[PDB]
Amino acid sequence: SNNWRWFDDRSGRWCSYSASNNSTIDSAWKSGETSVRFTAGRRRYTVQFTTMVQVNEETGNRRPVMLTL
Numbered sequence: 124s125n126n127w128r129w130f131d132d133r134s135g136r137w138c139s140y141s142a143s144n145n146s147t148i149d150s151a152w153k154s155g156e157t158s159v160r161f162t163a164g165r166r167r168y169t170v171q172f173t174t175m176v177q178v179n180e181e182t183g184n185r186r187p188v189m190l191t192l
Contacts, residue, residue: 125149127170129177130187137189152190 128137151159167180
């Protein structure tokens with residue numbers, strides 16, 4: 124299992140997804156999908172692997188993601 128992070132523009136640092144959301148994201152990546160949907164606090168997000176951005180499905184807000192193999 125790789126480590127996925129999202130950039131928190133409030134602190135100005137990368138943050139680890141929960142073990143659970145990391146597992147969802149990384150399984151989609153390894154299975155060859157180009158994007159993956161997950162929920163956190165009842166809100167819906169898509170990680171776009173082609174742009175390496177997390178998109179909020181309600182507001183369209185974009186946060187950067189990164190992968191460490």
